[PDB]
């Protein structure tokens with residue numbers, strides 16, 4: 001069900017990431033470096049356990065989860081959140097909840113590109129990843 005998402009992906013476009021980071025309370029110096037960072041995201045599965053790695057010259061993260069089962073997560077900006085990842089309308093939807101706040105990280109495939117939409121508050125960021133050659 002998630003197999004077309006699997007693989008190694010590189011950032012090739014970013015829109016409104018500063019807005020998204022600022023909405024989360026990320027400090028200006030982190031936003032500055034993040035605005036010039038191009039992560040590599042690796043998505044692997046082993047049965048219904050997915051592992052999602054995000055690698056860069058600045059921050060690295062890794063999460064493992066079962067679809068539809070809540071997991072604890074500590075985000076790149078050090079939020080301690082309750083997370084769940086599901087398939088919804090063919091999109092990989094990651095919902096994080098903490099302190100009554102909600103953010104979604106939604107991935108979809110459009111013409112072979114992986115489009116990551118990040119929403120928190122009113123901020124909507126769209127980042128595009130391409131499959132490694």
Ligand SMILES: CCCCCCCCCCC/C=C\CCCCC(=O)O
Pocket residue numbers: 011021024026030034037039041054055056058059060061075076077116127
């Ligand atoms: C691990 C590298 C993540 C992107 C660069 C650092 C951003 C740090 C501040 C914002 C962290 C909040 C949410 C994670 C955003 C992930 C964006 C992405 O996967 O393209």
